[PDB]
Design a protein around this ligand. Structure first.
Ligand SMILES: *[C@@H]1O[C@H](CO)[C@@H](O)[C@H](O)[C@H]1NC(C)=O
Ligand SMILES: *[C@@H]1O[C@H](CO)[C@@H](O)[C@H](O)[C@H]1NC(C)=O
Ligand SMILES: *[C@@H]1O[C@H](CO)[C@@H](O)[C@H](O)[C@H]1NC(C)=O
Ligand SMILES: *[C@@H]1O[C@H](CO)[C@@H](O)[C@H](O)[C@H]1NC(C)=O
Lengths: 468, 456
């Protein structure tokens, strides 16, 4: 080996190397201190996290309306106990609430006889209701009770005086918060006079027991001005209405409707549905369902769906089912009135195995809506679209940004995305990852361009891109 | 017995338990699969530890992997393993621990958004340089400081386990029930399982460091198997219980969304006392870095005792008796590595190469069994352990090569570049006088600058 001895090193390292060693040590310490000072400098002047909004329970997913239990299960199984067995499928849909009822006593057009505090024995006993509520609570499926005073008659609020009806409604609310329901729903408030006052009082009472309860109101008004009359005094009231009843089959018209409704109310929480107690398929053709579902699941609000809306159940294309409550189809034997009239393509059994079925899109969209922060409470911004397109951006803080493009037309078009309508923190990138499209024939996970993208007729694209 | 069991527990528990749970779960796809991957590692470590104990009692030479392989395979394999350990294993482990420290310190300031990368890197380098200076200044300071950090990490683990048990007794085990435990949000493939095991094996890394002190062990023959049997199951139980506490305190989706699982635990459970844990976690990371540096030095010494590394790396300070050049080289290598990769890519690198080295050593054990059947061995293990470990290692290596070719290929290439250096330096013994003059000049420059002499 070759090295210097200890005494030799002490002889050699004495004269001037001490100064060099001390200078290097001081330089190292100064560099370390400057490093720490810089660390503090960037830490202080860094952009700050945005605060969470503390969402309620009717904010993180859709609701599922069940107009009548008789048609949900079929003959011989339309009971609360039978519905207790469907919670597996309902949780598979990833819903966050059930609009159940009415189940209260209403024989025919009799104010005194109509009791809102007693359960009709035909739909089950109170013990069945308690068991169903407990089972749903264990599975995190909140239950909302419908409280329409008259559902078996033409008038939903009786032709006589209504103050006794209001007292009965209030007693029903107090009783069912004793029972443990997580909200209420009333329908056909048009026929109700001075409905704003009763709605305010009922919100008052319902919120008086806890802050985790809600009241839902429904009406058939299709004009914008009337809804603001009801919402001018109540600000935490979900109001479902036929605001999107007319189709038009035009992207620009739907964009105008949505933007005007949002701007008129500001940015308050809303509910997106085409009716109060009707399916999507009543006003839409077959090809528009896969697009309307994406639009509903990608808009800021709480989507509201009816039963059979995930499999495209229709009553106008299958004789033997009333339009008010079509019989839900689970397999080929669900409709025995006309044998051989159903296909294993329009049942739940025949669509749980097909990736290309509508139920798969429903489940994927529900899963995406129920987990991603941007879809949960992100800001919604719409920019210039094409001849018949409707495009918008969902963005929250630093999370993944989402872009939605929808084509309501029947003729192939191009993207035509125009900038200078979004904040500086949500500028569109040149290339964005593609999540999904409403029709087969598109490659998922492939980064698509945003300057030459072409639209197939009746197609919608959902795309992602991280913070940029 | 208990004299060495303490060290076995100490070297295994670093900071991997504060990093792996997010990495494993994302690849496991369910609570049950992850909590099974943990126990799998807890047995694969035990098998390798038993085989290593057999090798260590077979050859009384100290040095661990470097000493055994050189005895069995020859100079080339020993030099290649030393090259891999010096360049990849230790620097990447140090970089991972430093990045974890920076993440845990910066998380409370930015709870919902990721912290800036520049500040995190600068803070990690500040911590690493401070610990390097501390290790260069003295040795007794380093020993006492390491003991205090070990106390801190044990306190943190005990607190987490206790809070988890208290929550369990309160009737909050929704995720642990079979209805929710086996809720697969992604179908787990074989390659994803291999990647999950690579991520989860980082928590057990460092179990072979005991073999570095075998010469200092009194009556290794009896205490070594007892130490292994006492230690490895206890470590597996502690890790599994900590994972159980994590899952009972927070949901898997929100667990995957956090850059510091422990910090989220402390925020939601400890309340006002939350600030207690991230400090107590940070000490743990400190206790990693320091400790690793020590082993690094005790490797370089050996690397010069066999004439594989330049002697300048083995010299100690004249006054303080500290190995300055080894620490300087380690700090430089770790700083270079930190700029390139992310935490989990580095974890994949180090886990892949660690398993490659373990498999090579076990195959060397088998070759020694074949070649020298008359060697006196105090303890003899059945062939089942080496054959099962070899099969598992081969499957894991091929599956990880298939899953992530780039990082494993880079590691293999870096290992393969060590052959020409060995052939040019040690195999080639006809060095021109220019090379000798350059080596002597660099050694003299290092000696004069760092004020170091060869150990006596
Ligand atoms: C609800 O009732 C309480 C008690 O009378 C009152 O203080 C509160 O202002 C009411 N809220 C609304 C929105 O009317
Ligand atoms: C809405 O209700 C009013 C009042 O009963 C009725 O005249 C009108 O036809 C209804 N509109 C629709 C679209 O059903
Ligand atoms: C909403 O109203 C404001 C105020 O009149 C106006 O500036 C804005 O352009 C309106 N937005 C839309 C989409 O019509
Ligand atoms: C399946 O259902 C769709 C939608 O109603 C229909 O267009 C198609 O023809 C059906 N296919 C078969 C094979 O019956």
């Amino acid at each position: 080996t070759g090295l210097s001895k200890e005494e030799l090193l002490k002889v050699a390292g004495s004269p001037g190397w001490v100064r060099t060693r001390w200078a290097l040590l001081l330089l190292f310490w100064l560099g370390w201190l400057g490093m720490l000072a810089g660390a503090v400098v960037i830490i202080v002047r860094a952009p700050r996290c945005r605060e969470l909004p503390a969402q309620k329970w009717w904010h993180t997913g859709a609701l599922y309306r069940i107009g009548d239990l008789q048609a949900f299960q079929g003959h011989g199984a339309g009971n609360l106990a039978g519905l207790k067995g469907r919670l597996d499928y309902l949780s598979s849909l990833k819903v966050k609430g059930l609009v159940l009822g009415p189940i209260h006593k209403n024989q025919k057009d009799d104010v005194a006889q109509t009791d809102l505090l007693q359960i009709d024995p035909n739909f089950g006993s109170k013990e069945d209701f308690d068991s169903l509520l407990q089972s749903a609570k264990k599975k995190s499926i909140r239950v909302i009770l419908d409280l329409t005073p008259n559902y078996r008659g033409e008038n939903s609020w009786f032709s006589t005086q209504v103050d006794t009806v209001a007292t009965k409604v209030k007693d029903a609310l107090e009783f069912w918060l004793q029972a443990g329901v997580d909200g209420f729903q009333v329908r056909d408030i048009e026929n109700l006079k001075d409905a704003s006052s009763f709605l305010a009082e009922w919100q008052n009472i319902t919120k008086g027991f806890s802050e985790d309860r809600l009241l839902i109101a429904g009406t058939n008004s299709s004009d914008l001005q009337q809804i603001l009359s009801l919402l001018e005094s109540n600000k935490d009231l979900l109001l479902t209405s036929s605001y999107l009843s007319d189709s038009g089959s035009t992207g620009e018209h739907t964009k105008s409707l949505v933007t005007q409704y949002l701007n008129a109310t500001g940015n308050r929480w809303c509910s997106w549905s085409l009716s109060q107690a009707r399916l999507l398929t009543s006003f839409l053709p077959a090809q528009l369902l896969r697009l309307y579902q994406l639009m509903l699941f990608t808009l800021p609000g709480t989507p509201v769906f009816s039963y059979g809306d995930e499999i495209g159940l229709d009553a106008a294309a299958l004789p033997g089912q009333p339009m008010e409550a079509p019989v839900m189809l689970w397999d080929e034997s669900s409709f025995p009135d006309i044998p051989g009239a159903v296909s294993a393509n329009m049942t739940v059994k025949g669509q749980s195995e097909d990736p290309g079925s509508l139920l798969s899109l429903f489940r994927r969209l529900s899963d995406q809506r129920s987990k991603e922060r941007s879809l949960l409470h992100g800001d919604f911004h719409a920019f210039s679209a094409g001849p018949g397109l409707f495009s918008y951006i969902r963005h929250w803080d630093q999370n993944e940004r989402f872009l939605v493009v929808l084509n309501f037309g029947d003729v192939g078009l191009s993207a035509g995305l125009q900038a200078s309508d979004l904040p500086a923190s949500a500028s569109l990138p040149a290339k964005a990852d593609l999540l999904l499209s409403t029709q087969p024939g598109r490659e998922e996970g492939s980064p698509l361009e945003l300057e030459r993208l072409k639209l197939e007729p009746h197609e919608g694209l959902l795309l992602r891109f991280p913070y940029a | 017995l208990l004299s060495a069991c303490t060290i076995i527990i100490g070297n295994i528990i670093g900071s991997g338990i504060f990093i792996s749970p997010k990495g494993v779960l994302e690849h496991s796809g369910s609570v049950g699969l992850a909590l099974f991957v943990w126990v799998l590692g807890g047995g694969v470590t035990a098998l390798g530890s038993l085989c290593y104990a057999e090798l260590g009692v077979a050859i009384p030479k100290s040095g661990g992997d470097y000493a055994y392989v050189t005895e069995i395979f020859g100079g080339l394999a020993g030099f290649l393993l030393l090259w891999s350990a010096v360049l990849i294993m230790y620097p990447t482990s140090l970089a991972v621990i430093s990045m974890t420290f920076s993440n845990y310190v910066l998380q409370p300031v930015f709870p919902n958004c990721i912290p800036p990368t520049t500040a995190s890197r600068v803070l990690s380098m500040a911590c690493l340089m401070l610990l390097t200076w501390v290790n260069s200044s003295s040795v007794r300071w380093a020993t006492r400081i390491q003991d205090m950090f070990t106390g801190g990490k044990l306190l943190a683990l005990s607190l987490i386990i206790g809070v988890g048990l208290l929550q369990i007794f309160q009737g909050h085990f929704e995720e642990l029930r079979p209805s929710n435990a086996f809720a697969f949000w992604m179908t787990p493939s074989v390659g994803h399982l291999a990647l999950a095991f690579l991520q989860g094996s980082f928590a057990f890394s460092g179990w072979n460091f005991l073999n570095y002190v075998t010469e200092e062990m009194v009556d290794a023959r009896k205490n070594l198997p007892r130490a292994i049997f006492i230690s490895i199951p206890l470590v597996t139980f502690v890790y599994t219980f900590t994972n159980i506490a994590y899952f009972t305190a927070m949901s898997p989706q929100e667990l995957l969304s956090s850059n510091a699982v422990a910090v989220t635990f402390g925020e939601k459970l400890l309340g006002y006392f939350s600030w207690v844990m991230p400090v107590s976690v940070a000490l743990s990371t400190f206790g990693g870095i320091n400790g690793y540096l020590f082993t690094y030095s005790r490797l370089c010494f050996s690397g010069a005792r066999e004439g594989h590394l330049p002697s300048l790396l083995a010299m100690i300070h004249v006054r303080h008796c500290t190995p300055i050049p080894a620490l300087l080289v380690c700090c430089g290598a770790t700083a270079v590595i930190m700029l390139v990769g992310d935490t989990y890519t580095l974890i994949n690198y180090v886990s892949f190469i660690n398993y490659l080295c373990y498999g090579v050593t076990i195959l060397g054990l088998l070759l020694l069994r074949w070649r020298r059947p008359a060697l006196h061995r105090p303890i003899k293990v059945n062939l089942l352990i080496p054959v099962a470990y070899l099969v598992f290692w081969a499957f894991l290596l091929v599956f990880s090569f298939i899953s992530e070719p780039m990082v494993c290929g880079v590691g293999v290439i870096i290992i393969l570049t060590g052959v020409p250096i060995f052939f040019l330096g040690v195999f080639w013994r006809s060095k021109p006088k220019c090379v000798h003059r350059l080596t002597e000049s660099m050694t003299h420059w290092g000696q004069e600058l760092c004020f170091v002499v060869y150990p006596q």
